[PDB]
Amino acid sequence: PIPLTGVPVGDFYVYGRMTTLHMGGQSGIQATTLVNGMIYRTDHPEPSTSPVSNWEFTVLENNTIVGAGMGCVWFQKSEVLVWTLDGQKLSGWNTLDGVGTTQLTVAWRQHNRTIYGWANVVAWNSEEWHTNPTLRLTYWLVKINVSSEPEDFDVVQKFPLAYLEDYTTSKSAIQKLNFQTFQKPEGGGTLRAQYSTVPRQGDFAVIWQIGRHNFDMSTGKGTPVESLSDYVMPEQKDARIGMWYRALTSVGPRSDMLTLHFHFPTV
Amino acid sequence: PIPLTGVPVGDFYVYGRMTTLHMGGQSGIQATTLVNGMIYRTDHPPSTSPVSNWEFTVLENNTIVGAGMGCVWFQKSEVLVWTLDGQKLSGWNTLDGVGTTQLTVAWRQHNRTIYGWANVVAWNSEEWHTNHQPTLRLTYWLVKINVSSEPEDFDVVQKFPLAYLEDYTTASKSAIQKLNFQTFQKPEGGGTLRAQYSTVPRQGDFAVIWQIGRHNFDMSTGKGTPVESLSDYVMPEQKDARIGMWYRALTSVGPRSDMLTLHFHFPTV
């Protein structure tokens, strides 16, 4: 047997149980199915000097927004395997304990307080899908610097789904070529973000954003996504990053064995 | 560097690119987003050999010991295979020459049910509580394809997973029901939807067929019960799954293919 020793050198895979941050719910009811709630707040009580994207997380370089975070899954370095490849041969069975982070920071807007310097970007990956900047799905591996306990709160939440036109609950006219993202309320015109579990300092999380934005795979920087709507995808897509179905699922469990591939800075 | 040597000994993990069989579509329009198309055909035929209400049917001896509602396929070369010892790599193996079981998958195409299409190799199942009725279970089988059949695109009733929406509005809001798992019909124009089979597997390749809904399964024999129908579901507790299949099996939309990881179990003694 090969023990999980060493630190991943170069691009590396991370496979293990990853837990969704908050569940789409309503006060009193345990939210168990709505896995992809994306908090979308345009109101900016943030001082103009300290900016934050229209979403929950905001990737920043030096006070400048270089990305956004709509979804968040988190894990612990003790529950995940890490391996790096030589083509398709195993070149490392390593652990994240002692991984190096970048200067890039992630800011977490929580209900009524935003935690600047919540995490430091470690590695990333991204992929585009042309819709006619084009639509991209970018995610970041981040190392968590602080330990915060978020507060459940009702907020408007956009979800991924299909473009239906004659909806019934048990048949609806489905549009192909079409990705749709829209808000979904329960009770108020918003939806409760039920933070079931929560990571801590030293843990790891994988935040991501999907939609029209630009990204640069060597610097880890890009642009935040402003808004989400309908998207017409003309041709097919055979993706390689390994998280499109998780980022497009409407309903799922809280956690599941998910695999991810991450790329280090290569300026 | 460690090479891909040997066949997986024991329960193994398969990571790689997995391409779906057919995309939910319509004549004229290329089907690029409808990734979770589950063909539901209650019309059964030639009655001499059984068939399930879905596209694929796992049969031990003409008994329907399972059913296949979704399908992703790949070739043995585009996957990583590794078995574990807790957290230490027991083997960096390949599917080349892996052993199959006597369980057989039959594929009901448009007007052609190809029997002995695949032989089951391994399996995994995960249940999620829903309330002599079976619990909701997700069961997928790793199968070794024995033919190179070229299927035929055709329009039928197609089951699709999604949330429970109530006051729908698009172009866009809909009262969303938490705790709720809805699986309904997704046709276009008429009453059915076309299955656009594009990249189709060949002999010697592998596929992952899975079923979701009310059914029972045995992780020791690989035999279970087929899923009759799909409706609404209420999941009072949360699920922290461990099979790595729920998000791909429950997404309403997604790319034709992507990288997935799956844990499989061999026959138990």
Numbering used by the authors:
A (entry chain B): 408 to 539, 546 to 582, 585 to 682
B (entry chain A): 408 to 452, 454 to 539, 544 to 583, 585 to 682
What does the paper say about this structure?
The HAstV capsid precursor protein comprises several domains, including a highly basic amino terminus that binds to the RNA genome, a core domain that forms the icosahedral shell, a spike domain that forms dimeric protrusions, and an acidic domain with unknown function at the carboxy terminus. The HAstV-VA1 spike forms a dimer and shares a core beta-barrel structure with other astrovirus capsid spikes but is otherwise strikingly different, suggesting that HAstV-VA1 may utilize a different cell receptor, and an infection competition assay supports this hypothesis. The HAstV-VA1 spike structural domain forms a homodimer, with each protomer encompassing residues 408–684. Also similar to other HAstV spikes, the structural domain of each protomer of the HAstV-VA1 spike comprises a core antiparallel beta-barrel, formed by beta-strands 1, 9, 10, 16, and 18.
